[PDB]
Symmetry: C2
Subunit: 280 residues, 2 copies
Protein backbone atom coordinates (compact mmCIF):
# COMPACT_ATOMS: atom_id res chain seq x y z
CA UNK A 1 0.00 0.00 0.00
CA UNK A 2 1.19 3.59 -0.77
CA UNK A 3 0.19 6.64 1.36
CA UNK A 4 0.78 10.27 0.32
CA UNK A 5 0.16 13.79 1.59
CA UNK A 6 -1.28 15.72 -1.39
CA UNK A 7 -1.97 19.48 -1.72
CA UNK A 8 -5.60 20.10 -2.91
CA UNK A 9 -8.17 22.91 -2.21
CA UNK A 10 -5.47 25.16 -0.66
CA UNK A 11 -5.01 22.53 2.16
CA UNK A 12 -3.58 18.96 2.44
CA UNK A 13 -5.07 15.45 2.67
CA UNK A 14 -3.82 11.95 3.41
CA UNK A 15 -4.44 9.79 0.32
CA UNK A 16 -4.11 6.17 -0.86
CA UNK A 17 -1.97 6.24 -4.06
CA UNK A 18 -3.79 4.19 -6.77
CA UNK A 19 -1.34 5.01 -9.66
CA UNK A 20 1.59 7.37 -10.46
CA UNK A 21 -0.92 10.31 -10.74
CA UNK A 22 -4.21 9.09 -9.09
CA UNK A 23 -5.24 8.76 -5.42
CA UNK A 24 -8.23 8.43 -3.09
CA UNK A 25 -8.57 10.94 -0.21
CA UNK A 26 -8.65 9.34 3.27
CA UNK A 27 -11.26 11.57 4.96
CA UNK A 28 -10.55 13.32 8.29
CA UNK A 29 -6.71 13.56 8.04
CA UNK A 30 -4.58 16.49 6.79
CA UNK A 31 -1.54 14.19 6.19
CA UNK A 32 -0.11 10.63 6.60
CA UNK A 33 1.41 11.59 10.01
CA UNK A 34 -2.08 12.43 11.45
CA UNK A 35 -3.48 9.22 9.87
CA UNK A 36 -0.74 7.13 11.64
CA UNK A 37 -1.90 8.46 15.09
CA UNK A 38 -4.94 6.08 14.62
CA UNK A 39 -4.25 2.43 15.65
CA UNK A 40 -6.61 1.38 12.75
CA UNK A 41 -4.78 3.50 10.07
CA UNK A 42 -4.41 0.48 7.72
CA UNK A 43 -8.23 -0.18 7.81
CA UNK A 44 -8.88 3.59 7.19
CA UNK A 45 -6.41 3.57 4.24
CA UNK A 46 -8.08 0.41 2.80
CA UNK A 47 -11.56 2.11 3.08
CA UNK A 48 -10.50 5.51 1.53
CA UNK A 49 -13.90 6.98 0.44
CA UNK A 50 -12.92 10.66 -0.08
CA UNK A 51 -12.50 12.61 -3.33
CA UNK A 52 -10.70 10.91 -6.26
CA UNK A 53 -7.69 13.12 -7.10
CA UNK A 54 -5.46 13.25 -10.19
CA UNK A 55 -2.23 14.99 -9.04
CA UNK A 56 0.92 16.54 -10.55
CA UNK A 57 4.26 15.56 -8.87
CA UNK A 58 4.57 19.12 -7.40
CA UNK A 59 1.18 18.63 -5.63
CA UNK A 60 2.85 15.97 -3.37
CA UNK A 61 3.69 17.35 0.11
CA UNK A 62 6.41 15.89 2.36
CA UNK A 63 4.86 12.42 3.02
CA UNK A 64 5.05 12.98 6.84
CA UNK A 65 5.22 16.78 6.95
CA UNK A 66 5.14 17.23 10.82
CA UNK A 67 6.91 14.31 12.52
CA UNK A 68 7.82 15.01 16.18
CA UNK A 69 11.28 13.39 15.61
CA UNK A 70 13.58 12.90 12.60
CA UNK A 71 16.59 10.86 13.81
CA UNK A 72 19.38 10.70 11.16
CA UNK A 73 22.19 8.12 11.03
CA UNK A 74 25.77 8.71 9.86
CA UNK A 75 27.78 5.89 8.23
CA UNK A 76 25.58 2.80 7.61
CA UNK A 77 26.46 1.21 4.19
CA UNK A 78 28.95 -1.60 4.92
CA UNK A 79 30.55 -1.77 1.41
CA UNK A 80 30.84 2.08 1.29
CA UNK A 81 32.61 2.04 4.75
CA UNK A 82 34.98 -0.82 3.67
CA UNK A 83 35.92 0.99 0.35
CA UNK A 84 36.97 3.91 2.65
CA UNK A 85 39.33 1.36 4.35
CA UNK A 86 37.88 1.71 7.91
CA UNK A 87 36.17 -0.66 10.42
CA UNK A 88 32.37 -1.21 10.54
CA UNK A 89 31.06 0.95 13.43
CA UNK A 90 29.57 -0.99 16.40
CA UNK A 91 27.52 2.11 17.60
CA UNK A 92 25.04 4.16 15.47
CA UNK A 93 25.90 7.84 14.80
CA UNK A 94 22.65 9.81 15.53
CA UNK A 95 21.85 13.52 14.93
CA UNK A 96 18.58 15.49 14.59
CA UNK A 97 16.83 17.13 11.64
CA UNK A 98 14.01 19.47 12.64
CA UNK A 99 10.66 18.96 10.76
CA UNK A 100 10.99 22.58 9.40
CA UNK A 101 13.73 21.14 7.00
CA UNK A 102 11.16 18.88 5.22
CA UNK A 103 9.75 19.83 1.74
CA UNK A 104 7.68 18.12 -0.94
CA UNK A 105 9.40 15.36 -2.93
CA UNK A 106 9.37 17.64 -6.06
CA UNK A 107 9.64 21.11 -4.35
CA UNK A 108 12.38 23.65 -5.20
CA UNK A 109 14.99 24.00 -2.43
CA UNK A 110 15.11 27.83 -2.05
CA UNK A 111 18.48 28.70 -0.39
CA UNK A 112 19.30 32.08 1.17
CA UNK A 113 22.71 33.66 0.30
CA UNK A 114 24.38 32.88 3.72
CA UNK A 115 23.66 29.12 3.20
CA UNK A 116 24.46 28.68 -0.55
CA UNK A 117 28.29 28.16 -0.43
CA UNK A 118 28.62 24.38 0.22
CA UNK A 119 25.30 22.68 -0.66
CA UNK A 120 25.52 18.86 -0.89
CA UNK A 121 23.24 15.83 -1.57
CA UNK A 122 22.74 12.79 0.68
CA UNK A 123 20.26 10.27 -0.82
CA UNK A 124 18.79 8.09 1.99
CA UNK A 125 15.96 5.72 2.96
CA UNK A 126 13.42 6.97 5.55
CA UNK A 127 11.76 4.56 8.02
CA UNK A 128 8.40 5.84 9.31
CA UNK A 129 7.24 4.62 12.74
CA UNK A 130 3.74 3.01 12.99
CA UNK A 131 3.08 3.09 16.77
CA UNK A 132 4.73 4.33 20.00
CA UNK A 133 8.08 2.50 20.40
CA UNK A 134 9.68 2.60 23.86
CA UNK A 135 12.54 0.21 24.83
CA UNK A 136 11.71 -2.07 21.81
CA UNK A 137 13.87 -5.20 21.28
CA UNK A 138 15.34 -5.76 17.77
CA UNK A 139 13.25 -9.03 17.47
CA UNK A 140 9.93 -7.03 17.88
CA UNK A 141 10.94 -3.80 16.06
CA UNK A 142 9.61 -4.69 12.54
CA UNK A 143 6.06 -4.42 14.15
CA UNK A 144 6.71 -0.65 14.75
CA UNK A 145 7.52 0.16 11.05
CA UNK A 146 4.60 1.78 9.15
CA UNK A 147 6.62 1.94 5.94
CA UNK A 148 9.47 3.43 3.92
CA UNK A 149 10.07 6.50 1.79
CA UNK A 150 12.96 8.47 0.29
CA UNK A 151 14.68 11.59 1.65
CA UNK A 152 17.51 13.91 0.60
CA UNK A 153 19.47 14.71 3.83
CA UNK A 154 20.29 18.03 2.10
CA UNK A 155 23.48 19.41 3.72
CA UNK A 156 25.19 22.82 4.13
CA UNK A 157 28.74 21.41 4.60
CA UNK A 158 30.24 24.72 5.85
CA UNK A 159 27.60 24.87 8.67
CA UNK A 160 27.91 21.08 9.26
CA UNK A 161 31.67 21.29 10.13
CA UNK A 162 31.63 24.82 11.73
CA UNK A 163 31.52 24.15 15.55
CA UNK A 164 33.26 23.10 17.56
CA UNK A 165 36.07 22.92 14.95
CA UNK A 166 37.74 19.65 16.21
CA UNK A 167 34.46 17.70 16.80
CA UNK A 168 31.76 19.67 14.93
CA UNK A 169 28.06 19.02 15.79
CA UNK A 170 26.45 18.37 12.37
CA UNK A 171 22.88 19.47 13.35
CA UNK A 172 23.20 23.13 12.18
CA UNK A 173 24.31 21.91 8.65
CA UNK A 174 21.55 19.25 8.58
CA UNK A 175 18.42 21.29 9.45
CA UNK A 176 18.27 24.24 6.98
CA UNK A 177 14.53 24.98 6.76
CA UNK A 178 12.74 23.83 3.54
CA UNK A 179 15.78 21.81 2.26
CA UNK A 180 15.01 18.05 2.53
CA UNK A 181 12.84 16.38 -0.17
CA UNK A 182 10.73 13.63 1.46
CA UNK A 183 8.48 11.12 -0.39
CA UNK A 184 7.16 10.60 -2.91
CA UNK A 185 4.83 8.50 -0.68
CA UNK A 186 5.18 5.88 2.08
CA UNK A 187 5.30 2.21 0.97
CA UNK A 188 4.22 -0.33 3.68
CA UNK A 189 6.66 -3.21 4.40
CA UNK A 190 4.34 -5.84 2.76
CA UNK A 191 4.94 -3.98 -0.59
CA UNK A 192 8.74 -3.38 -0.39
CA UNK A 193 11.76 -5.73 -0.43
CA UNK A 194 15.30 -4.59 0.50
CA UNK A 195 18.01 -5.26 -2.14
CA UNK A 196 17.05 -2.70 -4.85
CA UNK A 197 19.40 0.22 -5.69
CA UNK A 198 19.43 3.58 -3.89
CA UNK A 199 20.85 6.08 -6.40
CA UNK A 200 21.31 9.89 -6.39
CA UNK A 201 21.65 11.94 -9.64
CA UNK A 202 23.07 15.49 -9.96
CA UNK A 203 21.85 17.16 -13.22
CA UNK A 204 21.06 13.62 -14.53
CA UNK A 205 24.54 12.10 -13.67
CA UNK A 206 24.63 9.24 -11.05
CA UNK A 207 26.73 10.37 -8.01
CA UNK A 208 25.59 7.75 -5.44
CA UNK A 209 24.78 4.02 -5.80
CA UNK A 210 24.26 1.20 -3.25
CA UNK A 211 22.08 -1.88 -2.70
CA UNK A 212 19.54 -1.12 0.11
CA UNK A 213 20.29 -4.43 1.94
CA UNK A 214 23.93 -3.47 2.75
CA UNK A 215 23.13 -1.68 6.10
CA UNK A 216 25.47 -1.95 9.14
CA UNK A 217 22.50 -0.99 11.44
CA UNK A 218 19.16 -2.43 10.12
CA UNK A 219 15.98 -0.34 10.76
CA UNK A 220 15.14 -2.90 13.54
CA UNK A 221 18.59 -2.34 15.21
CA UNK A 222 18.21 1.46 14.90
CA UNK A 223 14.72 1.22 16.56
CA UNK A 224 16.13 -0.91 19.45
CA UNK A 225 19.11 1.45 19.83
CA UNK A 226 17.18 4.77 19.67
CA UNK A 227 14.11 3.68 21.74
CA UNK A 228 16.31 2.69 24.79
CA UNK A 229 17.29 6.43 24.89
CA UNK A 230 13.92 8.11 24.10
CA UNK A 231 10.64 6.84 22.60
CA UNK A 232 9.67 7.12 18.91
CA UNK A 233 6.00 7.97 18.24
CA UNK A 234 3.74 7.04 15.32
CA UNK A 235 4.71 9.42 12.47
CA UNK A 236 8.38 9.80 13.61
CA UNK A 237 11.13 9.16 11.04
CA UNK A 238 14.54 7.39 11.08
CA UNK A 239 16.78 8.37 8.10
CA UNK A 240 19.06 5.30 7.74
CA UNK A 241 22.20 6.97 6.21
CA UNK A 242 23.87 7.75 2.83
CA UNK A 243 26.52 5.81 0.85
CA UNK A 244 29.68 7.39 -0.79
CA UNK A 245 29.77 9.88 -3.72
CA UNK A 246 28.78 13.05 -1.71
CA UNK A 247 30.06 16.23 -3.49
CA UNK A 248 32.09 17.29 -0.42
CA UNK A 249 34.39 14.18 -0.80
CA UNK A 250 34.67 14.25 -4.67
CA UNK A 251 37.81 15.20 -6.69
CA UNK A 252 37.31 17.93 -7.57
CA UNK A 253 35.06 18.94 -4.59
CA UNK A 254 31.52 19.52 -6.06
CA UNK A 255 28.59 21.45 -4.48
CA UNK A 256 25.06 22.11 -5.80
CA UNK A 257 24.79 25.27 -7.92
CA UNK A 258 21.86 27.58 -8.67
CA UNK A 259 19.27 25.80 -10.88
CA UNK A 260 20.80 22.28 -10.37
CA UNK A 261 18.47 19.27 -9.63
CA UNK A 262 19.19 16.33 -7.28
CA UNK A 263 17.14 13.16 -7.81
CA UNK A 264 17.12 10.35 -5.18
CA UNK A 265 15.62 7.00 -6.30
CA UNK A 266 15.06 3.75 -4.39
CA UNK A 267 13.89 0.88 -6.60
CA UNK A 268 10.48 -0.18 -5.08
CA UNK A 269 9.82 3.19 -3.26
CA UNK A 270 9.85 5.74 -6.13
CA UNK A 271 11.95 8.92 -6.36
CA UNK A 272 12.20 12.58 -5.34
CA UNK A 273 13.64 15.36 -7.51
CA UNK A 274 14.38 18.81 -5.98
CA UNK A 275 15.81 21.81 -7.90
CA UNK A 276 18.14 24.10 -5.87
CA UNK A 277 17.14 27.75 -6.38
CA UNK A 278 19.14 30.63 -4.94
CA UNK A 279 16.92 33.21 -3.27
CA UNK A 280 16.02 36.44 -5.17
CA UNK B 1 6.35 38.42 36.13
CA UNK B 2 6.86 34.68 36.87
CA UNK B 3 4.80 31.92 35.11
CA UNK B 4 4.63 28.23 36.19
CA UNK B 5 3.00 25.01 35.03
CA UNK B 6 1.55 23.40 38.19
CA UNK B 7 0.31 19.80 38.55
CA UNK B 8 -3.08 19.72 40.35
CA UNK B 9 -3.97 16.03 40.91
CA UNK B 10 -5.34 14.79 37.53
CA UNK B 11 -5.09 18.25 35.85
CA UNK B 12 -2.30 20.81 35.20
CA UNK B 13 -2.63 24.64 34.94
CA UNK B 14 -0.66 27.63 33.67
CA UNK B 15 -0.31 30.03 36.65
CA UNK B 16 1.13 33.44 37.60
CA UNK B 17 3.46 32.83 40.62
CA UNK B 18 2.55 35.20 43.55
CA UNK B 19 5.11 33.84 46.12
CA UNK B 20 7.44 30.82 46.54
CA UNK B 21 4.43 28.45 47.02
CA UNK B 22 1.28 30.38 45.83
CA UNK B 23 0.05 31.24 42.28
CA UNK B 24 -3.02 32.59 40.41
CA UNK B 25 -4.57 30.26 37.76
CA UNK B 26 -4.50 31.58 34.17
CA UNK B 27 -7.87 30.12 33.03
CA UNK B 28 -8.09 28.26 29.68
CA UNK B 29 -4.56 26.70 29.55
CA UNK B 30 -3.01 23.39 30.77
CA UNK B 31 0.55 24.78 30.79
CA UNK B 32 2.78 27.77 30.00
CA UNK B 33 3.57 26.35 26.50
CA UNK B 34 -0.14 26.40 25.45
CA UNK B 35 -0.46 29.92 26.94
CA UNK B 36 2.52 31.22 24.78
CA UNK B 37 0.74 30.11 21.57
CA UNK B 38 -1.65 33.03 22.21
CA UNK B 39 -0.47 36.38 20.74
CA UNK B 40 -1.76 38.28 23.85
CA UNK B 41 -0.34 35.73 26.36
CA UNK B 42 1.40 38.57 28.23
CA UNK B 43 -1.97 40.42 28.87
CA UNK B 44 -3.75 37.08 29.75
CA UNK B 45 -0.94 36.40 32.36
CA UNK B 46 -0.89 40.02 33.72
CA UNK B 47 -4.75 39.86 34.04
CA UNK B 48 -4.84 36.29 35.51
CA UNK B 49 -8.16 36.04 37.41
CA UNK B 50 -8.48 32.24 37.98
CA UNK B 51 -8.42 30.37 41.36
CA UNK B 52 -5.63 31.22 43.87
CA UNK B 53 -3.60 28.01 44.55
CA UNK B 54 -0.89 26.74 46.91
CA UNK B 55 1.62 24.26 45.45
CA UNK B 56 4.42 22.09 46.81
CA UNK B 57 7.77 22.19 44.92
CA UNK B 58 7.37 18.63 43.60
CA UNK B 59 3.96 19.69 42.06
CA UNK B 60 5.75 22.06 39.59
CA UNK B 61 5.96 20.58 36.03
CA UNK B 62 8.63 21.48 33.42
CA UNK B 63 7.75 25.20 32.98
CA UNK B 64 7.26 24.56 29.21
CA UNK B 65 6.58 20.81 29.14
CA UNK B 66 6.17 20.28 25.31
CA UNK B 67 8.38 22.80 23.37
CA UNK B 68 8.69 21.81 19.65
CA UNK B 69 12.45 22.64 19.73
CA UNK B 70 15.06 22.62 22.48
CA UNK B 71 18.26 23.96 20.90
CA UNK B 72 21.33 23.48 23.16
CA UNK B 73 24.60 25.50 22.96
CA UNK B 74 28.10 24.14 23.76
CA UNK B 75 30.87 26.33 25.28
CA UNK B 76 29.47 29.82 25.97
CA UNK B 77 31.16 31.36 29.10
CA UNK B 78 34.14 33.52 27.90
CA UNK B 79 36.27 33.35 31.13
CA UNK B 80 35.79 29.50 31.24
CA UNK B 81 36.87 29.15 27.54
CA UNK B 82 39.90 31.52 27.94
CA UNK B 83 41.02 29.67 31.18
CA UNK B 84 41.04 26.38 29.21
CA UNK B 85 43.46 28.19 26.78
CA UNK B 86 40.93 28.15 23.89
CA UNK B 87 40.07 30.97 21.45
CA UNK B 88 36.45 32.17 21.88
CA UNK B 89 34.27 30.52 19.20
CA UNK B 90 33.18 32.70 16.22
CA UNK B 91 30.26 30.25 15.66
CA UNK B 92 27.78 28.76 18.15
CA UNK B 93 27.92 25.01 18.78
CA UNK B 94 24.29 23.64 18.47
CA UNK B 95 22.73 20.21 19.23
CA UNK B 96 19.19 19.00 19.98
CA UNK B 97 17.52 17.71 23.18
CA UNK B 98 14.08 16.15 22.53
CA UNK B 99 11.31 17.45 24.85
CA UNK B 100 10.85 13.79 26.00
CA UNK B 101 14.00 14.56 28.09
CA UNK B 102 12.22 17.35 30.16
CA UNK B 103 11.15 16.78 33.81
CA UNK B 104 9.77 19.04 36.52
CA UNK B 105 12.21 21.31 38.39
CA UNK B 106 12.12 19.06 41.57
CA UNK B 107 11.39 15.72 39.80
CA UNK B 108 13.62 12.63 40.33
CA UNK B 109 15.84 11.62 37.34
CA UNK B 110 15.02 7.89 36.98
CA UNK B 111 17.92 6.25 35.08
CA UNK B 112 17.89 2.77 33.49
CA UNK B 113 20.85 0.39 34.07
CA UNK B 114 22.40 0.81 30.52
CA UNK B 115 22.52 4.65 30.99
CA UNK B 116 23.90 4.99 34.58
CA UNK B 117 27.77 4.65 34.14
CA UNK B 118 28.73 8.32 33.41
CA UNK B 119 25.83 10.63 34.57
CA UNK B 120 26.91 14.30 34.60
CA UNK B 121 25.43 17.77 35.37
CA UNK B 122 25.37 20.89 33.18
CA UNK B 123 23.65 23.83 34.95
CA UNK B 124 22.41 26.29 32.31
CA UNK B 125 20.05 29.21 31.69
CA UNK B 126 17.03 28.52 29.42
CA UNK B 127 15.65 31.19 27.02
CA UNK B 128 11.93 30.66 26.18
CA UNK B 129 10.67 32.14 22.86
CA UNK B 130 7.46 34.24 23.12
CA UNK B 131 6.46 34.56 19.42
CA UNK B 132 7.45 32.92 16.09
CA UNK B 133 11.04 33.98 15.26
CA UNK B 134 12.26 33.58 11.63
CA UNK B 135 15.42 35.40 10.33
CA UNK B 136 15.40 37.76 13.37
CA UNK B 137 18.24 40.34 13.63
CA UNK B 138 20.08 40.61 16.98
CA UNK B 139 18.86 44.22 17.44
CA UNK B 140 15.18 42.93 17.32
CA UNK B 141 15.73 39.56 19.13
CA UNK B 142 14.67 40.64 22.71
CA UNK B 143 11.07 41.19 21.41
CA UNK B 144 11.02 37.35 20.79
CA UNK B 145 12.05 36.40 24.40
CA UNK B 146 9.12 35.40 26.69
CA UNK B 147 11.50 34.88 29.61
CA UNK B 148 14.22 32.86 31.29
CA UNK B 149 14.42 29.71 33.39
CA UNK B 150 16.97 27.16 34.65
CA UNK B 151 17.78 23.80 33.02
CA UNK B 152 20.08 20.86 33.86
CA UNK B 153 21.48 19.67 30.46
CA UNK B 154 21.70 16.24 32.15
CA UNK B 155 24.35 14.20 30.30
CA UNK B 156 25.25 10.52 29.70
CA UNK B 157 28.96 11.14 28.83
CA UNK B 158 29.56 7.54 27.60
CA UNK B 159 26.70 8.05 25.05
CA UNK B 160 27.71 11.68 24.28
CA UNK B 161 31.21 10.65 23.05
CA UNK B 162 30.32 7.22 21.56
CA UNK B 163 29.81 7.83 17.79
CA UNK B 164 31.63 8.54 15.69
CA UNK B 165 34.77 8.16 17.93
CA UNK B 166 36.84 10.95 16.21
CA UNK B 167 33.98 13.59 15.96
CA UNK B 168 31.16 12.26 18.16
CA UNK B 169 27.60 13.65 17.78
CA UNK B 170 26.51 14.50 21.36
CA UNK B 171 22.71 14.32 20.82
CA UNK B 172 22.40 10.61 21.92
CA UNK B 173 24.14 11.62 25.20
CA UNK B 174 21.94 14.74 25.62
CA UNK B 175 18.33 13.50 25.17
CA UNK B 176 17.82 10.65 27.71
CA UNK B 177 14.06 10.26 28.45
CA UNK B 178 13.01 12.22 31.61
CA UNK B 179 16.50 13.53 32.61
CA UNK B 180 16.52 17.39 32.42
CA UNK B 181 14.87 19.48 35.16
CA UNK B 182 13.39 22.73 33.79
CA UNK B 183 11.97 25.70 35.76
CA UNK B 184 11.18 26.37 38.49
CA UNK B 185 9.19 28.96 36.50
CA UNK B 186 9.78 31.48 33.71
CA UNK B 187 10.77 35.03 34.69
CA UNK B 188 10.00 37.76 32.10
CA UNK B 189 13.03 39.77 30.89
CA UNK B 190 11.68 43.04 32.51
CA UNK B 191 11.97 41.17 35.90
CA UNK B 192 15.50 39.78 35.32
CA UNK B 193 18.97 41.39 35.29
CA UNK B 194 22.01 39.48 33.81
CA UNK B 195 25.15 39.47 36.06
CA UNK B 196 24.00 37.26 38.98
CA UNK B 197 25.70 33.87 39.66
CA UNK B 198 24.71 30.60 37.91
CA UNK B 199 25.86 27.81 40.25
CA UNK B 200 25.53 23.98 40.29
CA UNK B 201 25.73 21.89 43.51
CA UNK B 202 26.32 18.11 43.79
CA UNK B 203 25.04 16.99 47.27
CA UNK B 204 25.17 20.67 48.42
CA UNK B 205 28.87 21.17 47.29
CA UNK B 206 29.43 23.86 44.54
CA UNK B 207 30.77 22.23 41.31
CA UNK B 208 30.09 25.08 38.79
CA UNK B 209 29.95 28.90 39.02
CA UNK B 210 29.79 31.85 36.55
CA UNK B 211 28.32 35.33 36.33
CA UNK B 212 25.34 35.07 33.87
CA UNK B 213 26.66 38.12 31.89
CA UNK B 214 29.91 36.40 30.66
CA UNK B 215 28.31 34.83 27.49
CA UNK B 216 30.24 34.67 24.17
CA UNK B 217 26.81 34.42 22.44
CA UNK B 218 23.95 36.43 24.06
CA UNK B 219 20.32 35.18 23.90
CA UNK B 220 19.88 37.84 21.14
CA UNK B 221 22.90 36.53 19.13
CA UNK B 222 21.72 32.91 19.49
CA UNK B 223 18.19 33.91 18.26
CA UNK B 224 19.75 35.67 15.22
CA UNK B 225 22.09 32.77 14.48
CA UNK B 226 19.52 29.92 14.94
CA UNK B 227 16.52 31.67 13.19
CA UNK B 228 18.59 32.17 9.99
CA UNK B 229 18.83 28.29 9.80
CA UNK B 230 15.26 27.41 10.97
CA UNK B 231 12.42 29.25 12.79
CA UNK B 232 11.72 29.16 16.57
CA UNK B 233 8.04 28.93 17.58
CA UNK B 234 6.46 30.39 20.71
CA UNK B 235 7.30 27.98 23.61
CA UNK B 236 10.59 26.84 21.99
CA UNK B 237 13.74 26.76 24.21
CA UNK B 238 17.40 27.79 23.73
CA UNK B 239 19.68 26.46 26.49
CA UNK B 240 22.63 28.92 26.44
CA UNK B 241 25.43 26.55 27.59
CA UNK B 242 27.37 25.57 30.75
CA UNK B 243 30.60 26.87 32.38
CA UNK B 244 33.45 24.65 33.71
CA UNK B 245 33.38 22.19 36.66
CA UNK B 246 31.47 19.32 34.95
CA UNK B 247 32.28 15.91 36.60
CA UNK B 248 33.71 14.49 33.31
CA UNK B 249 36.47 17.24 33.27
CA UNK B 250 37.30 16.90 37.06
CA UNK B 251 40.40 15.06 38.45
CA UNK B 252 39.35 12.61 39.64
CA UNK B 253 36.28 12.22 37.30
CA UNK B 254 33.08 12.35 39.44
CA UNK B 255 29.73 11.12 37.97
CA UNK B 256 26.27 11.30 39.66
CA UNK B 257 25.59 8.17 41.73
CA UNK B 258 22.30 6.66 43.01
CA UNK B 259 20.44 9.05 45.37
CA UNK B 260 22.67 12.09 44.70
CA UNK B 261 21.04 15.52 44.15
CA UNK B 262 22.12 18.21 41.62
CA UNK B 263 20.84 21.75 42.35
CA UNK B 264 21.09 24.47 39.63
CA UNK B 265 20.58 28.03 40.85
CA UNK B 266 20.52 31.31 38.91
CA UNK B 267 20.30 34.45 41.09
CA UNK B 268 17.10 36.22 39.95
CA UNK B 269 15.48 33.10 38.38
CA UNK B 270 15.33 30.57 41.28
CA UNK B 271 16.66 27.01 41.37
CA UNK B 272 15.89 23.43 40.33
CA UNK B 273 16.90 20.38 42.39
CA UNK B 274 16.72 16.86 40.92
CA UNK B 275 17.69 13.62 42.73
CA UNK B 276 19.14 10.87 40.52
CA UNK B 277 17.39 7.51 41.21
CA UNK B 278 18.55 4.38 39.48
CA UNK B 279 15.46 2.42 38.50
CA UNK B 280 14.51 -1.00 39.89
Amino acid sequence: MRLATIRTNGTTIAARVESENTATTIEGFANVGELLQESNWRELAENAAGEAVTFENKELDAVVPAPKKIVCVGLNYANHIKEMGRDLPDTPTLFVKFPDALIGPFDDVVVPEWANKALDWEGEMAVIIGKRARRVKQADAAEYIAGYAVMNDYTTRDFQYAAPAKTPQWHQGKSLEKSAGFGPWMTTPDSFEFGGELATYLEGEKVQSTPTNDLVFSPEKLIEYITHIYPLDAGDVIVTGTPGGVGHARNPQRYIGDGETVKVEIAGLGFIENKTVFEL
